[PDB]
Amino acid sequence: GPETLCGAELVDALQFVCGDRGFYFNKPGIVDECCFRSCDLRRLEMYCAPLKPAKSA
């Protein structure tokens, strides 16, 4: 998604992904991994709980 964004906007970047290629809302634990802070791109693809995306390369 971005590269730094825990000030709410994280959710829009997160929501580009989240559908098995990530979560779907009802699942929690996700926004959590971002707002451990220095929120992420491609660790974006490890915070919306995503597997394959572009995290892996």
Can you describe what's shown?
One of its GO terms (biological process) is cell activation. Belongs to the insulin family. Its main location: secreted. By secondary structure, this protein is mainly α. The protein has one domain (1-57): Insulin-like (Insulin-like, subunit E). It contains two helices and no strands. It has helices at residues 10-14, 30-34. It is globular. It starts with 9 loop residues before the first helix and ends in a 23-residue tail after the last helix.
Report the helical percentage: 10-25%
**CATH third-tier fold name:** Insulin-like, subunit E
Count helical runs: 2
Structural class: mainly alpha
First-last Cα distance: 14 Å
According to DSSP, the number of beta strands is 0
Proportion of β residues? under 5%
H/E topology pattern:
HH
Radius of gyration, in Å, reads: 10 Å
Domain count: 1
Instruction: Give the CATH architecture.
Output: Orthogonal Bundle
Q: Could you name the CATH class?
A: Mainly Alpha
What can be said about the biggest beta sheet? Answer: none
- Anisotropy-based shape: globular
Fourth-tier CATH superfamily name: Insulin-like
Subcellular location: Secreted
GO cellular component, one term: alphav-beta3 integrin-IGF-1-IGF1R complex
GO biological process, one term: postsynaptic modulation of chemical synaptic transmission
Keywords: Deafness, Disulfide bond, Dwarfism, Growth factor, Intellectual disability, Secreted, Signal
Chart the SSEs and their pairings.
Blueprint: H1 10-14, H2 30-34
Structure summarized in a few sentences:
This protein is mainly α. It is built from two helices and no strands. The protein has a single domain (about 1-55), classed as Orthogonal Bundle (Insulin-like, subunit E), CATH 1.10.100.
